[PDB]
Amino acid sequence: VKQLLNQLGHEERTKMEENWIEEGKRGRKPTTISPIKCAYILNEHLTFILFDDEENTKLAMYQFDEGIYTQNTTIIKRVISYLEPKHNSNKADEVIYHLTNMVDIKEKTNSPYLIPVKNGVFNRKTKQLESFTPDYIFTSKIDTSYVRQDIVPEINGWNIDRWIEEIACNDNQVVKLLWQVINDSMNGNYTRKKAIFFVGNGKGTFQELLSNVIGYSNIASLKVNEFDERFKLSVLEGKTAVIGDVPVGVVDDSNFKSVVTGDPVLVEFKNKPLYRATFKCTVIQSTNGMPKFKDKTGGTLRRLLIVPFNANFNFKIKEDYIKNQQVLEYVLYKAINLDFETFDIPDAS
Amino acid sequence: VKQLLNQLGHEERTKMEENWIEEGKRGRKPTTISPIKCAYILNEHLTFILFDDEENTKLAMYQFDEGIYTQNTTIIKRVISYLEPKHNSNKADEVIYHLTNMVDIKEKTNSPYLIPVKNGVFNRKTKQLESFTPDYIFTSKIDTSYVRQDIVPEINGWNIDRWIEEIACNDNQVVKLLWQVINDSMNGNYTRKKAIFFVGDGNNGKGTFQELLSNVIGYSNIASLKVNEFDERFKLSVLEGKTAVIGDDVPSSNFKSVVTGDPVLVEFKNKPLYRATFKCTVIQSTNGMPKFKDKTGGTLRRLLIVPFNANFNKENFKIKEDYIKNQQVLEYVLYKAINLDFETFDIP
Amino acid sequence: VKQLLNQLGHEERTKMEENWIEEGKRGRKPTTISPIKCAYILNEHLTFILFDDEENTKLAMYQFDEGIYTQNTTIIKRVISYLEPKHNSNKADEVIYHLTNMVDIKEKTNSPYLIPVKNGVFNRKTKQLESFTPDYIFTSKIDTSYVRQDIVPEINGWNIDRWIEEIACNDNQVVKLLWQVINDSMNGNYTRKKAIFFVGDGNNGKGTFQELLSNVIGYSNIASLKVNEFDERFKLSVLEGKTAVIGDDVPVGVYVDDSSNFKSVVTGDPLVEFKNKPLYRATFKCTVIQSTNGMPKFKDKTGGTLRRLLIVPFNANFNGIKENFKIKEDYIKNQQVLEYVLYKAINLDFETFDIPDASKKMLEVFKEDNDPVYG
Amino acid sequence: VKQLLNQLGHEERTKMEENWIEEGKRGRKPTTISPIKCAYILNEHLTFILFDDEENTKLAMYQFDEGIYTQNTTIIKRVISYLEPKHNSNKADEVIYHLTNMVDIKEKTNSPYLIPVKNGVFNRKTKQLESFTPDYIFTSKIDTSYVRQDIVPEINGWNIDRWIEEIACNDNQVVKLLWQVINDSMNGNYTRKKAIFFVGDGNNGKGTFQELLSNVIGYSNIASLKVNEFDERFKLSVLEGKTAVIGDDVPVGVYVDDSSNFKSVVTGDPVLVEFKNKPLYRATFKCTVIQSTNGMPKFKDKTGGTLRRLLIVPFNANFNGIKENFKIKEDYIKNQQVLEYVLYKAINLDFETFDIPDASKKMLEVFKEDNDPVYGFKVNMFRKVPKYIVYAFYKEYCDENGYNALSSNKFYKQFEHNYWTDAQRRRIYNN
């Protein structure tokens, strides 16, 4: 879109120059487009939306290349520079404010059957890949492309399914639960209100596999205990999942329950106004043994999930075996093809 | 109101343009409405108020379609942009400041006989629903609509009254007490000076009942607290603008003060302490007798026990997952609770 | 590049003056280059990049004489002043903002086979030195030059290898471990997964070894962080900008309340804080070194916790034997000694930490002490 | 430099006026020197440097009369006002920014053999006084002039040397140690890796000696930090730019649970210094620590490092009677002649390590026994095979109200030292 914005800006500047010429030499030459006019042009020729009408909400822009709306002000300002390079930070803030005033309000789509992938959006109802369109509102996506495959890729004669069964003590129910966990993890715009927890080994390598199948930038590292403090939740924007390693043998249950659910939370930015935002990223936490559960409530056991990790676990597995693109594509394909509505109960736990 | 402001826009602008024309080419074609003129137009053609003369009191705007006053700055900025798009954030702030200087001071209607809901204002004295008017001052309303009803809605052939009776072990007295509890919970301006305790052994439908009671009220109108942390500092802050507080489990002076209407000292982070009166009703659920270490007359009088026991501890998963989310059952229970009137709770 | 930027600034000012003269006198003698034009000139003639596209990411500039990209604002301001002296702080910030909007995004090259030193890049896969190029993206380089070493330097009859042997109490396994520790210390883009703990008491030379490591790495390239201070506000803010971190001292048997952050740091698992920058999440591959007496206990005791730590014995006493102060404040500061140490350590090949027998015995002793169940 | 800058500003303004005259009356006549031209003139004539290339580091200016570079923005702005009085705070900041962009970067002179003194720098290797020059980069100096002394100055019939002898209770080792302590305190780039502790109870004159040290050295050059204050937040920021740190009164028997920062400061070990809401950074402090307290506080670590770092000075003379002379601490130690003589005597004294008095060794041993119960046991116990009998719960904690171990860590006693084995031999009055 850089070429389109450059051409539009050049055309607008030439039109302004001609209009000034026909009015004669009055003052200095107008060479920069007014921020309101820039905002009009951008709203006409691009897709800018507003997630909600809350206090100091941030404008979202549809990235055509990625197909997901973003609230990153740096990318928006780069687009502004594409349209008008002479605008400094203050003028970019002004044009962003004008766009915020004009744009329409749309709610983020939370359809369980639609999951964004780097190649496109996968629909579970038809189990098909569809090209990116602005009509779907997404904030994060998986960075491993979805491809059609019929075999199990093998690197150095290593099978992913057999390895998963080895980690899972070779039981059908637990491996099905693991596949369901992958399916829930890769869904960044929909949540089942389930907080995934890892209890144990093989936990670290599986955690790294999860962090690899999703984009590293899409992954945010946070523990349950550190959700509450100020200036810590702002890192959850545009993140597909949040994975953390809570202390071994150490659990509030404030905002952790809010982010587990789709409930809005008052997120804050440093030297920026606070605003209410909704995060649907899947939460994964790792520790040895049962969490402390200071609350001791039935609803807590209702919402959270427990994944057993018991094994006898070799530096090779860490590198180039879980970071392989083919392995990530295969695991994404296998997990996304699985269809489920309720969680399973493994016989090993 | 966007059409009205747009019509007002580029019409005052034309007046300024023709004034400049008749005054000669000396203003370089002033095409931007001054912030004070924008404030004049907005005050004339809209309804802006100020809740009180407190320091840095935020201007409130009456949303004609919503029927309630809002202090949301973003909506006011959007309205100003509708009048005149060519304003910075600073210029729109100047417009807001001028309006704050101009507008009259009105106090929020805190009448216990008036309850705002999505359809309008319900008056218990007249037992009637009235359309939204700027005369009434409400900062929130119940998101569930209120309509006249004649039958009990059912989803998948499942009743609400039968479900409530099954939760209430099919006793008329406790069913009436539950209806009274809902009636008090929805009313945020009246307390009745009673703390309702749900005592049970398992689920018994108490969790899904609390979920339903949260659903019927607005999402942000409910507060979550337990007994143990009423004494702890900064925990009162969650009661700043709530209508009721409901807990889930219970693993004392401040709690007693919150139960009654006497003021309590609320403290905000990086903000001086101040005393405030809370009329929100408190509902607590737990397994067995709630923990207490100040056994005396006041605590015993203030506490009210509503036992819950059934086979729900069928787990009623279908009821909790989607049945309470249905708009029909929500509006039905809201209407049934709003029609019911009483003076005080009845002991089981 | 100062002369080049001065020449371009003078040429641009002359061109603007000529354009104003031919246009008349309307511009009233424009003499300051516009910030957008300054950004265009700097981008065309210099190498400015953006590490990654997130909120408030700082522009990086390639220092031709240093060979490492720097995000230091002051250096970029000085370069802009070279181009246009008359710009104040706000105009220079505008230039930086325009450059940030204009430049492309490239990620930092994190390959464990490349190690930057004062002379240039060093490649372990081929084991040679290459001249600095903007293609290799580095944020910090080792302050010790890499030269070919033929003989071991000696000052006042003091030999660095003999000093290492004296520190190590004459064991080949532990000297190999020390050399591997140094080699890991230079390489900040890879982790050995095992923490380094210099355990000793009194005049054991652990402080001297830490000072030697700081000198060979460079004082500015190393930051001091505590084992107990791993997770707290405004901490770890400068840790990302340094190749390695060392703990000067650790209390004996000190209890650790947050070792999960410590485990993430040592293992390489992934959050930085700043005065006016939002929190940013990144992995920590810098080696972790702590000097202490005994092995402090940990509340997260397990197989992983025990295996993630390595004990480096320091069983030499230099109080009964007359200590040479010049060893610690004079000898290890010599450039030749540091160059020889860097050459010898970087030429060594690393696969895993070679555990000495004494280290194994002390590890078993700590395992018995921390968990009485095994004992 | 005020006259030079005033003349430069006047001539520059006249030149600008002439340029405006010859270019014709275009707009308002220029009367204020542009910040860039002002910075050019200041760089050409004055001496401005930058200590390092780090983020937003502060420009340093060489004060010709003072002889030391200063980073105080007030002095720099006063100089700028001397050159251009019409510049407000923002324009002065612009001038400072331009100077920062222009000037070159030189590191601080941290040679241990050079000591900045009010008269001039002092070369310890040469034992000479060299005049101030901008080549030597210093940010602080001793507030006492260095002059050649031949005869002891006596004020009101009171001798500083006799007073020093009185403080030490007429002990040559102790007075030698005190002079060595003064010499170490004056030097800010050499540490000697020893912690000085003034131990004495009741009236002794510890505070008087500390005030004498704070008088001979610059008062602003002395930090105030007790040993127990080292490890909490923002405390190390005080140590920055200080030649020595003095703890006025450590609480008696305070529990020093954490000593890492204290040990780092005592030696030349680097440490992470943090300022209040300013970018924290790593730095090395060579300032010596001197603490005065009644009795020796005990440390948690009670290991070899804290023993070797500590030094104890005897203050046994008592003045808690008519012998007390207030003028000694109020007026006598503030005399300029006395301070000059003390500085001369201390700086001319040379040595490489502290000369430990015999009494100090005895008190060091006593503190080792008190802090570490094991060594107290070893001293008090004055056979070999029986370990249980010699253990006996530290022979009932050697009568010191201590806490014992599970007879497992007790054998660390042979670390301090039961040569190894009988098979039949392996509260009580009882060896």
Ligand SMILES: Nc1ncnc2c1ncn2[C@@H]1O[C@H](COP(=O)(O)OP(=O)(O)NP(=O)(O)O)[C@@H](O)[C@H]1O
């Ligand atoms: N091989 C050696 N021969 C002689 N002196 C040495 C040797 N190695 C080190 N030293 C000296 O011994 C001292 C050890 O340095 P230092 O930093 O005090 O050690 P440390 O082990 O950190 N002490 P501590 O903090 O109490 O555990 C210094 O004075 C060194 O110069």
Ligand SMILES: Nc1ncnc2c1ncn2[C@@H]1O[C@H](COP(=O)(O)OP(=O)(O)NP(=O)(O)O)[C@@H](O)[C@H]1O
């Ligand atoms: N040689 C001396 N002869 C007489 N008086 C002295 C002598 N040295 C110091 N003094 C006085 O004795 C007092 C010492 O007070 P100061 O040094 O502050 O406390 P301290 O003696 O170290 N401890 P404390 O008694 O607990 O306050 C002051 O009045 C000094 O002037």
Ligand SMILES: [Mg+2]
């Ligand atoms: Mg040490």
Ligand SMILES: [Mg+2]
């Ligand atoms: Mg005293």
